[PDB]
């Protein structure tokens with residue numbers, strides 16, 4: 001469980017993401033796909049993209065990263081009281097998309113990397129620790145839901 005102060009460090013960097021969620025989503029996907037190329041294979045609509053240039057030029061990938069980061073932002077704004085938001089996300093990710101916990105760890109690492117590069121004003125050591133705690137909570141709670149749903153993760 002995160003303290004209020006830790007949540008405020010999470011929300012204060014998220015406020016900067018929200019100046020341009022689409023651009024942050026593009027940087028996070030490009031980071032994820034370059035660092036862990038196997039993750040791109042889970043996206044039927046995007047697995048043909050061959051280069052960072054193609055990923056940046058994809059209007060559909062840009063829209064997807066706005067949907068993904070906005071869903072994450074809604075979770076983080078609940079400050080751990082995210083049961084309702086996790087239910088549909090867990091169900092789709094366990095049963096339709098089949099996204100292992102290790103891949104949620106990879107996207108968490110990409111989110112952290114991008115915030116570290118873009119936002120040193122709001123993403124010093126303490127703020128990064130708070131964001132990691134929040135992402136670790138998310139992944140713990142998703143993994144519990146996965147198990148209830150029948151998926152190993």
Ligand code: HEM
Pocket residue numbers: 039040042043044045046064067068069071072088089092093097099103104107
């Ligand atoms: C912070 C973690 C993540 C969040 C908040 C998130 C959120 C979302 C949301 C809101 C959608 C659309 C609704 C739905 O189908 O549930 C979606 C779709 C999808 N997500 Fe996730 N996602 C996350 C991580 C991942 C990761 C790591 C992968 C794969 C490695 C993944 C694969 C997919 C796929 C394949 C779809 C369908 C994409 C399409 O329509 O073309 N997601 N995600």
